[PDB]
Design a protein around this ligand. Structure first.
Ligand SMILES: CCCCCCCC/C=C/CCCCCCCC(=O)OC[C@H](O)CO
Ligand SMILES: CCCCCCCC/C=C/CCCCCCCC(=O)OC[C@H](O)CO
Ligand SMILES: CCCCCCCC/C=C/CCCCCCCC(=O)OC[C@H](O)CO
Ligand SMILES: CCCCCCCC/C=C\CCCCCCCC(=O)OC[C@H](O)CO
Ligand SMILES: CCCCCCCC/C=C\CCCCCCCC(=O)OC[C@H](O)CO
Ligand SMILES: CCCCCCCC/C=C\CCCCCCCC(=O)OC[C@H](O)CO
Ligand SMILES: CCCCCCCC/C=C\CCCCCCCC(=O)OC[C@H](O)CO
Ligand SMILES: CCCCCCCC/C=C\CCCCCCCC(=O)OC[C@H](O)CO
Ligand SMILES: CCCCCCCC/C=C\CCCCCCCC(=O)OC[C@H](O)CO
Ligand SMILES: CCCCCCCC/C=C\CCCCCCCC(=O)OC[C@H](O)CO
Ligand SMILES: CCCCCCCC/C=C\CCCCCCCC(=O)OC[C@H](O)CO
Ligand SMILES: CCCCCCCC/C=C\CCCCCCCC(=O)OC[C@H](O)CO
Ligand SMILES: *C\C=C(C)/C=C/C=C(C)/C=C/C1=C(C)CCCC1(C)C
Ligand SMILES: *C\C=C(C)/C=C/C=C(C)/C=C/C1=C(C)CCCC1(C)C
Ligand SMILES: *C\C=C(C)/C=C/C=C(C)/C=C/C1=C(C)CCCC1(C)C
Lengths: 230, 230, 230
């Protein structure tokens, strides 16, 4: 098609589709009520992403935003996907370590503020204000990262060894890949505009696939997702 | 008013209003914590629908969408109602059979994908793509229907006989009436345009009232909604 | 800036920010799983409000709506904030008295109808219809107020005395301050237009800060938020 980033949108669509199908077939027959929750959560994540990658591929998920005296292409469908997928991914982690309800609310609520302030920043027509929104969004993210190291890492250790080991890996995956998101937004098409749109779209595609399908491959092969049973 | 479908919107509004009022008066005094949940869920459903039928009657819930080189009337308020009412109706069924949490998440999440992809298809400006969205939405629906027969029908039987009998009736009601929705959309104003808007609006009105107020009349007269008590 | 109401938006922003920071520092170290829920809920409330007051300050949260043959400034960001903060505030109360699930659903669902019909009324382009939406919204509110006196006040009394006393105060705070909202909307810029926008913005600022940060100061100093323990 006529937008150079199309190839990375097509490839993202295909990878999320294949991931959904694999997790769906792999979850068939699972009867353990605990693993059923982890399959439910983890298969819904790439199914949502599939539909929203497709909407960007087909042009629905794209709008033009005037700032810096120019009509800027903004993919708003990213924030519609992230709004529902990112709390499910934190739910996978919190259920692993059997977090208490107060802590789950805090994580999901902070996650909503991070995504919502990011959408306002993406659509903001006053250039300098877009970075104010980027700052508030990044602060909400640092709160989440703090919780994952100084609330969760200290209960998982008092848990089943298989739980503690699977959580450590997935926590480390989460902190590394989530930290790259604020930087790519800042230097790409929504921010300073140093990196062009087609390269920004490739970077996000590599990040989006790793943090959902990669994460899922690690979790759903683990023994931690089953109750202990004879 | 000046749109021929107004009479079916007015009648839908009145029927949802009367239904809400009846379920509200009937639920007064109920103290059983179990029946309270079924009344809560089941009365919220026609109250939401009342407000959204009214917005279509008054013109707020209507927009024009250009496709096939024509300005097409699209009632978007349908998807704002269905987004909150359809998961409540599946919650009535899952609580009946005491479904496990993993299965409820799967049903509600699949329901969200079905409604969300339906809204994208309703607003899509490229004619042939509207049917791609219709196909993904229908696939999410088939997943839901499968769950209701090959996950739920097999636990309800291991339950109280009054539960098993009320669920069978409501499951059958659900599968028959929900299957008509994809067909009416395809042949009506959002799709191929064979059936005109005023007749499509009548068909949906008959389907919307039956699946909410009819469903509710069956459930709230049943003994299944109470715990077993002496 | 060039809108006279800016000073009340700036002051609201600052007060919600300071409130968030105070509740955040005060909740540090709390380990009781019960108080953790009350801190989680109660700190998220002024953090959401901070971001949405800021969006009104910076102009993002403002739109123009044509009615009465005039282009009317409508702050739509109010309803985006109230949509997520008002159910959390009712969750604080229901958890205090350990409400049953059916009753919480009813309150949160009625709250959604009240806010949603209020947004439709704020954006409605036919003047006389805006008050129809105001009436349906006010009816949903009266339902909520009824529940708080003739469902909750009668279980809190059968509870811990510290719970019963803290709930009475917060219930009374809630009923008084929430009842002022329908009146200010009716006589201000969204309704009859008797009170001008800058004064309406001051009134709401005083109401918004009292009902969130004031409410929170009362609740989080109470002993009711902790389980009974030795
Ligand atoms: C898992 C196994 C596979 C791992 C794969 C990891 C890929 C992730 C990173 C890709 C960045 C590639 C960036 C390519 C940028 C080219 C930019 C370019 O053309 O620069 C010239 C410019 O136009 C004028 O100076
Ligand atoms: C529960 C007791 C009551 C049950 C009630 C069930 C009604 C449901 C179906 C109605 C379809 C009616 C369709 C009417 C279509 C008329 C179309 C027409 O006028 O066709 C001519 C056309 O304009 C040029 O060929
Ligand atoms: C907690 C301690 C502090 C308590 C503080 C409570 C304040 C709340 C109410 C304020 C209303 C003030 C209204 C000011 C209205 C002025 C209107 C005006 O100028 O009227 C003239 C008009 O322009 C032509 O007739
Ligand atoms: C436990 C539940 C916790 C839930 C916590 C949720 C946190 C979200 C808070 C604020 C972001 C609000 C974002 C609103 C963005 C609307 C932007 C929009 O729709 O813009 C339309 C148009 O382009 C412009 O007028
Ligand atoms: C002037 C400062 C600006 C205003 C402040 C920034 C607001 C938006 C940013 C981040 C949200 C941070 C997280 C909000 C949620 C906190 C939840 C909480 O306190 O949870 C405690 C509970 O004990 C858990 O275990
Ligand atoms: C722990 C995770 C935290 C994640 C958040 C980290 C944020 C700060 C990082 C980098 C900013 C680097 C400065 C970028 C600003 C460049 C300004 C500019 O105009 O640069 C000119 C350009 O390089 C040529 O034209
Ligand atoms: C457990 C919780 C599970 C929740 C699962 C949720 C599933 C929804 C997923 C994707 C649909 C997203 C739909 C987004 C549609 C937005 C369309 C819109 O607003 O269009 C505005 C404008 O007309 C055009 O720019
Ligand atoms: C190439 C194929 C296209 C991509 C695929 C279509 C995606 C969208 C369609 C349907 C969603 C189907 C349901 C998604 C939710 C599945 C939940 C699940 O797996 O739940 C298992 C759990 O054990 C429960 O008891
Ligand atoms: C189990 C529930 C499944 C529900 C989903 C079932 C979907 C397929 C059904 C019918 C499609 C029939 C074909 C419709 C296409 C008509 C094409 C056309 O242009 O027809 C010309 C017209 O008839 C004169 O002008
Ligand atoms: C347990 C969960 C219970 C949840 C209960 C939820 C109750 C909400 C119901 C109806 C309000 C719907 C409001 C929809 C308003 C949309 C307005 C809008 O977006 O307008 C865009 C544009 O300006 C115009 O086309
Ligand atoms: C013709 C009349 C117009 C139509 C009617 C107005 C609809 C919208 C207004 C108010 C919603 C009222 C509250 C709706 C929720 C009721 C929940 C319920 O019944 O809960 C019972 C349960 O036992 C709890 O403990
Ligand atoms: C329990 C909580 C309930 C809260 C809900 C209470 C609603 C009714 C209250 C007041 C309406 C007063 C009438 C306002 C209408 C004024 C009409 C008008 O045009 O007035 C002319 C103006 O005063 C000069 O030009
Ligand atoms: C599905 C893929 C994932 C892991 C999405 C994560 C998204 C973020 C961590 C977003 C954070 C942002 C910040 C912190 C600042 C503004 C821009 C973002 C919304 C991308
Ligand atoms: C409140 C009434 C009910 C039962 C609503 C049900 C709606 C559906 C089953 C919608 C399904 C659709 C599909 C499967 C395909 C695109 C069009 C729809 C969104 C109507
Ligand atoms: C965060 C502050 C609070 C307490 C917000 C409460 C908002 C209401 C009680 C809103 C009610 C409305 C009604 C009943 C009628 C239309 C206008 C409103 C949406 C403001």
């Amino acid at each position: 098609t006529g937008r150079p980033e199309w190839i990375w949108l097509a490839l993202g669509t295909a990878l999320m589709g294949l991931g959904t199908l694999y997790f769906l077939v792999k979850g068939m027959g699972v009867s353990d009520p605990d693993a059923k929750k982890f399959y439910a959560i983890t298969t819904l994540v790439p199914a949502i992403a599939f539909t929203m990658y497709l909407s960007m591929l087909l042009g629905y998920g794209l709008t033009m935003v005037p700032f810096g005296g120019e009509q800027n292409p903004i993919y708003w469908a990213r924030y519609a996907d992230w709004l529902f997928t990112t709390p499910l991914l934190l739910l996978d982690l919190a259920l692993l370590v059997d977090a208490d309800q107060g802590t789950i609310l805090a994580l999901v609520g902070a996650d909503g503020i991070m995504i919502g302030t990011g959408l306002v920043g993406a659509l903001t027509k006053v250039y300098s204000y877009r970075f104010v929104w980027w700052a508030i969004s990044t602060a909400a993210m640092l709160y989440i990262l703090y919780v994952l190291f100084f609330g969760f890492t200290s209960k998982a250790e008092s848990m089943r060894p298989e739980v503690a080991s699977t959580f450590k890996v997935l926590r480390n995956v989460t902190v590394v890949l989530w930290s790259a998101y604020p930087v790519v937004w800042l230097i790409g098409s929504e921010g300073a505009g140093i990196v062009p749109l087609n390269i920004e779209t490739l970077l996000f595609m590599v990040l989006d696939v790793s943090a959902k399908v990669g994460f899922g491959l690690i979790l759903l092969r683990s023994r931690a997702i089953f109750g202990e049973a004879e």
